[PDB]
Structure 1
Amino acid sequence: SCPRVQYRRRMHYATRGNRMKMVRTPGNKLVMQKRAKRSQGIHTPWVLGHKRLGGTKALRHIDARLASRHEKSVSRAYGGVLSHDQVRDRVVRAFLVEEQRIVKQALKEHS
């Protein structure tokens, strides 16, 4: 006979925030323990793809607040915000677009 369980906290609805697991206790009882909600993790900007960043953990609220700064970023520029391919694109684009402005401005000054 499969034992039947009851809700143990005052909320009794099967929502995404009220998910429980069945737990066998040292007293050989089957109880319900609430599943902690999860975060999706640190992502890149939605306009840039919305992809999970490398070297960053997925922590929720209290966990992200008490964790060290390295669980949520890298040592590279824009660490924990942009990815390695997005940072390299900006470094190249910052230098190359600036160079074109210098060449065009010098050409104007020479004429």
Structure 2
Amino acid sequence: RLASRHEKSVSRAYGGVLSHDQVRDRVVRAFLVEEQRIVKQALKEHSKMKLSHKRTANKKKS
């Protein structure tokens, strides 16, 4: 209680809570798991618009 904050923490994120091998394993999965959904979200909107000209292009075919 009487000590400075520096004997109980360290200068980076989650310092004094998490270690160096798992601060980085959260930085890496905060990037790779967010970006994996962006690949699957933009794949989903690209599929529904290809449906929007697979059948709306059949208005000029019968």
- TM-score for both structures, normalised by structure 1: 0.42
User: In structure 2, what is the equivalent of residue 76 of structure 1?
Assistant: 12
Q: How does 1:58-97 map to 2 (within 5 A)?
A: 65-97=1-33
Is there any run of 5+ residues in structure 2 with no aligned partner, and where?
A: 48-62
1-side partners of 2:3 and 2:22: how far apart? 26
Cα deviation, 1:50-102, whole Å, max 9, x if unaligned, reads: xxxxxxxxxxxxxxx00000000000100000000010000000000000000
1-side partners of 2:36 and 2:21: how far apart? 22
2-side partners of 1:106 and 1:66: how far apart? 53
Higher relative strand content: 1
User: In structure 2, what is the equivalent of residue 53 of structure 1?
Assistant: none
Higher relative helix content: 2
Is there any run of 5+ residues in structure 1 with no aligned partner, and where?
A: 1-64
2-side partners of 1:86 and 1:97: how far apart? 16
Larger radius of gyration: 1
RMSD: 0.3
User: In structure 1, what is the equivalent of residue 45 of structure 2?
Assistant: 109
Higher relative contact order (CA 8 A, sep 6+): 1
- TM-score for both structures, normalised by structure 2: 0.75
Q: How many residue pairs align between the two structures?
A: 47
Runs of 4+ in 1 over 3 A off after TM superposition: none
